[PDB]
Design a binder for this molecule. Structure first.
Ligand SMILES: Nc1ncnc2c1ncn2[C@@H]1O[C@H](CSCC[C@H](N)C(=O)O)[C@@H](O)[C@H]1O
Lengths: 570, 362, 100, 39
């Protein structure tokens, strides 16, 4: 039992030193208890306190009830009359939540999890204290097999001695930081490109891409290239320097820092020729020794591609009725089902055409401008040119589930005055979020409800139904949890997702249910994002209560929203 | 340890009994008054010698048919009159002045119910009412204006029922059925600005109502302490007590044992467990213990009606030399306990409308 | 209204989530903090707005860029958009003028 | 609306709108009434 005792005493070494320690801050807290308790006691001494007074009879209320607190012991039972407390009104029940104007995607057993590595270090002490009997004594207590041949393996795991840690392992400080390395053009943008998300053009978007960086080919000859002696010392001001620059389409003693050389590697990738603008950006060097070091860099590194294309199609031959054929195809094969609504996904076709293999095509949905399908893809939307307002049955975009994009319905001013609030269009509001003002009040039907502040007409935009993104299967689980207390905050956004407003959302989540509502729900497509809005089923005046059909099953409707609040006139 | 039952009274309503309160907000020589909340009745008593207890003025909520849950002694500096706030299942706060015999401060706004009441140790005009909707709201009763609210978007995803002030009122621990341990620092530069502004408000000053604040980011959180519901945590100075239904009481400090409580960042997740004052026969929650005024003596009741008693001296969970006091006549359910402003008088309350006073045998 | 472009708590949560990232140096980390907090402050949605946001963001915080001395990281952060076609060359020139 | 019937056309079952009266005033009125009948 000596090996267990050695193992126990090795474990005991930190055990009793803990006991020695705990006694210390036991004492240190105790004195802090004594200091503070006395201090507050002193102030309690300062605060004069009125002694209590006993109850007295009230003549006007002799009808009040009397209670006799029975004594469990021999003591007599004492009697003092009751008294009715003050009355206070009560408000409808409601659970906590947080405001939200967009959409957001989303024990107690064992100790410390892992077998303690310090005990391994305690086991290492068993390795150092070391013939065969020692090997198994080492191997018996700890789960390992610590024979001398295994001593080396444990020594091998000891030789790690350090961890790289949660940091960029490569020396990649911020360029503004003096320690920035001469990092190439690509590696620096890696952090930016990975974190950024263009679909909401924010870094680490909360509603979204990693497939490719901006690998698309772009024109490079759009520069004016008026190479003139404008940089005192430049590619110009010297015919030899200028002629050498043109043919390539020694730097002075002013050296280049690694950070300077690093973003020098970036600036060439932007212009490939604009030493002056590079010099304008790089105040550390004049245009000379920028062009010269560009010569030095271009001599060392491979020359840039600098390629431009124009594509065979130029104009016409793209009558939109041809697009009408394509969606007619899409409607006849798959979209005739009208039930499999898929969230948009950016299809990628680096060299493939927008064939039937297109993810958007198989998803029965148009390719968005975010897709890698080129500017000639036939699955993209054509442009929403409704002259008066992109807002009616003649508006294909209104006929579509897609809100007329700001860059498309140029005739309804969707792009015009994005800062301004009033536009000719009506089917552009959700982008601008021209929500109406609402009021919160206890609904007549059940608990809290929503009331509108101002009169509105039929089919007028109202506030969005914000929430959080959650998958269907978990919506079952949360919904499974929801039915145990008759809650409902899950909305079937599409065939693939359900939105929840239980924890995050805006005020509209408290809207009640009615079978004959003044408002109705309508899914919509916005910038590749599925959203649901509400519109007035009829014209509405000031102070109305709002309703819409939750559209569950008939049996489900009786289960939750059975209240109808209607008298029969006939 | 030096204690015995000397008195026991039972209320005639036979309703389950709830939070006890002894008026530690008194003066030297004042009558020793304590209060207790029943289902809808509220009763006050004063301990007396020989084992006698004189029933004091008692009221009943004959209008709100709800079970009162929590209460806290109150004091007014202006009139020097003590009071005592109450709360229950309907989530409404009433504060009765015994001098006024009545409550004239009405405060509503919590969602479902109130399960905790405690005042600021220094300012008697600040109160935390932990609620059923996971909400942590603060009221400036002196100005009747609301103060910052805690929880919200990143608060407890389950009902909180237990919270505590520290001795100086700088950090507030919070724990609920989610077994989460979230605390917030009062001393946060923003808050006392609002607290000062909470005392600086006029409804007639402007149409704009007072702007209470919102918090969602505790200075620390964890759940590893208990695998069952937690209902009893207290500020043992810089150390934190914690009790669950699993028949154990554990004390612990954030991070490592050398880590300052006030230096701990919100990103911290480490724990230092140094408490083993375990118990038994009390596998159900909604039981609350009591503390002496000087933080030197811990007494906890039992469902089977016994007592679990320990001191806060150098006696430590290294051995946990318990004192299991027991009265045979009380065995139904010890709902709560309450010390006096000393260590001489202990009042144990059973669920079946019966109380059991234990006096120190020193 | 009780409602606006962007709630306060959301600003706090996103800033905290930024610090979680380890591969990002603090020079960059501050860059999107200011730039992002600029975004849902105004909620731009168009490419034209994207450019207009550029001189707008530099106009408001160009001095703060000097104060943080995180300019060089900010030019690179600009170049990405020019790679993403949301930025033109003369737009980059505008930032240089605003900075200096 | 010409066919507007009586005011009863509201609802079938809705939450109670909460009574304005109170209990402790009710007892005081009763005892005031009781002592009123005593004379
Ligand atoms: N017409 C209706 N009658 C009864 N319950 C309804 C209802 N419409 C909605 N509900 C209930 O309300 C929940 C939606 S959240 C809205 C709650 C309700 N307006 C209140 O403040 O009390 C659903 O879980 C549903 O069960």
């Amino acid at each position: 039992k000596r090996v267990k005792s050695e193992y126990m005493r090795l474990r005991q070494l930190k055990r009793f030193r803990r006991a020695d320690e705990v006694k210390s801050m036991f004492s240190s807290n105790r004195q802090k208890i004594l200091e503070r308790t006395e201090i507050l006691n002193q102030e309690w001494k300062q605060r004069r306190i009125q002694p209590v007074h006993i109850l007295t009879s009230v003549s006007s209320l002799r009808g009040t009830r009397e209670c006799s607190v029975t004594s469990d012991l021999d003591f007599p039972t004492q009697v003092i009359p009751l008294k009715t407390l003050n009355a206070v009104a009560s408000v409808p029940i409601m659970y906590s939540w947080s405001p939200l104007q967009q959409n957001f995607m989303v024990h107690g057993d064992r100790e410390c999890g892992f077998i303690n590595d310090e005990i391994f270090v305690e086991l290492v002490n068993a390795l150092g204290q070391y013939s065969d009997k020692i090997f198994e004594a080492i191997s018996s207590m700890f789960p390992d097999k610590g024979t001398a041949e295994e001593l080396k393996e444990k020594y091998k795991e000891l030789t790690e001695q350090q961890l790289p840690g949660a940091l960029p392992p490569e020396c990649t400080p911020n360029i503004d930081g003096p320690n920035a390395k001469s990092v190439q053009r690509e590696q620096s943008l890696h952090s930016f490109h990975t974190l950024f998300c263009r679909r909401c053009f924010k870094y680490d978007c909360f509603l979204h891409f990693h497939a490719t960086p901006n690998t698309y080919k772009r024109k490079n000859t759009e520069t004016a290239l008026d190479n003139k002696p404008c940089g005192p010392q430049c590619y110009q001001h010297l015919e030899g320097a200028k002629e050498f620059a043109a043919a390539l389409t020694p730097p002075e003693n002013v050296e280049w820092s690694g950070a300077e050389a690093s973003m020098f590697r970036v600036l060439i990738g932007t212009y490939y020729d604009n030493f002056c603008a590079i010099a304008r950006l790089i105040g550390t060097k004049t245009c000379r020794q920028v062009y010269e070091f560009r010569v030095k860099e271009s001599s060392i590194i491979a020359p840039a591609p600098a390629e431009d294309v124009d594509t065979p199609p130029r104009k016409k031959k793209r009558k939109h009725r041809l697009w009408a054929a394509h969606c007619r195809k899409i409607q006849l094969k798959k979209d005739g089902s009208s039930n499999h609504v898929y969230n948009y996904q950016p299809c990628d076709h680096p060299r493939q055409p927008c064939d039937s293999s297109c993810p958007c095509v198989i998803a029965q949905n148009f390719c968005e401008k975010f897709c890698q399908c080129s500017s000639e893809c036939q699955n993209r939307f054509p442009g929403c040119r409704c002259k008066a307002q992109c807002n009616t049955k003649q508006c294909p975009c209104y006929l579509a589930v897609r809100e007329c994009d700001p860059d498309l319905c140029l005739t309804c001013g969707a792009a015009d005055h994005w800062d301004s609030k009033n536009v000719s269009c009506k089917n552009c509001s959700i982008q601008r979020g021209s929500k109406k003002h609402l009021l919160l009040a206890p609904s007549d039907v059940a608990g809290w409800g929503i009331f509108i502040k101002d009169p509105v007409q039929k089919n007028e935009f109202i506030s969005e139904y914000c929430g959080e993104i959650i998958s269907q299967d978990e919506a079952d689980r949360r919904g499974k949890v929801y039915d145990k207390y008759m809650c409902s905050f899950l909305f079937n956004l599409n065939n693939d997702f359900v939105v929840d407003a239980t924890r995050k959302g805006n005020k509209i989540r408290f809207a009640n249910h009615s079978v004959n509502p003044n408002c109705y729900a309508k899914v919509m497509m916005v910038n590749g994002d599925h959203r649901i809005g509400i519109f007035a089923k009829r014209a509405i005046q000031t102070g109305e209560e709002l309703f819409f059909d939750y559209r569950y099953s008939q049996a489900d409707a009786l289960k939750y929203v059975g209240i109808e609040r209607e008298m029969e006139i006939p | 340890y030096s204690f015995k039952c000397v008195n026991s009274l039972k209320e005639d309503h036979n309703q389950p009994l709830f939070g006890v309160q002894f008026n530690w907000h008194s003066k030297e020589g004042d009558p020793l008054v304590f209060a207790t909340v029943g289902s809808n009745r509220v009763t006050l008593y004063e301990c007396h010698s020989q084992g006698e207890i004189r029933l004091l003025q008692s009221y009943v909520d004959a209008d709100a048919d709800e079970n009162f849950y929590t209460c806290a002694w109150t004091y007014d500096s202006n009139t020097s009159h003590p009071l005592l706030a109450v709360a229950g299942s309907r989530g409404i706060i009433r504060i009765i002045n015994p001098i006024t015999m009545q409550c004239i401060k009405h405060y509503v706004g919590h969602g479902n119910a109130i399960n905790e009441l405690k005042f600021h140790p220094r300012d008697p005009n600040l109160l935390l009412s932990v609620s059923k909707d996971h909400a942590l709201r603060l009221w400036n009763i002196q100005t009747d204006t609301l103060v910052a609210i805690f929880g919200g978007v990143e608060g407890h995803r389950d009902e909180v029922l237990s919270a505590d002030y520290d001795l100086l009122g700088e950090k507030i621990m919070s724990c609920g059925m989610d077994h989460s341990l979230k605390l917030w620092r009062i001393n946060s530069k923003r808050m006392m600005n609002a607290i000062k502004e909470s005392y600086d408000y006029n409804p007639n000053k402007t149409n704009r109502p007072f702007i209470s604040q919102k918090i969602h980011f505790p200075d620390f959180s964890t759940r590893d302490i208990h695998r069952n519901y937690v209902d009893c945590v207290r500020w043992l100075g810089d150390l934190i007590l914690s009790k669950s239904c699993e028949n154990a009481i554990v004390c612990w400090k954030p991070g490592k044992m050398e880590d300052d409580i006030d230096k701990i960042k919100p990103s911290e997740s480490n724990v230092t467990i140094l408490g083993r004052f375990d118990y038994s026969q009390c596998d159900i929650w909604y039981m609350r213990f009591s503390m002496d005024f000087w933080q030197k003596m811990l007494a906890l009741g039992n469902q089977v009606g016994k007592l679990y008693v320990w001191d806060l001296e150098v006696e430590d969970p290294h051995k946990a030399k318990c004192t299991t006091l027991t009265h045979h006549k009380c065995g139904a359910a010890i709902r709560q306990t309450s010390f006096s402003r000393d260590s001489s008088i202990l009042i144990a309350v059973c669920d079946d409308a019966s109380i059991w006073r234990w006096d120190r045998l020193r | 209204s009780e409602d606006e472009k962007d709630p306060e708590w959301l600003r706090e949560k996103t800033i905290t989530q930024i610090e979680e990232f380890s591969d990002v140096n603090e020079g960059e980390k501050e860059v999107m903090k200011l730039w992002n907090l600029h975004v849902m402050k105004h909620g731009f949605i168009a490419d034209n707005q994207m450019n207009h946001a550029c001189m707008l963001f530099v106009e408001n915080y160009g001095q703060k860029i000097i104060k943080k001395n995180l300019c060089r990281n900010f030019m690179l952060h600009l170049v990405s958009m020019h790679d993403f076609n949301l930025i033109s060359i003369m737009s980059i020139d505008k930032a240089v003028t605003k900075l200096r | 609306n010409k066919r507007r019937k009586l005011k009863n056309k509201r609802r079938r079952s809705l939450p109670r709108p909460h009574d304005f009266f109170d209990a402790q005033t009710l007892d005081a009125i009763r005892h005031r009434a009781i002592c009123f009948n005593l004379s």
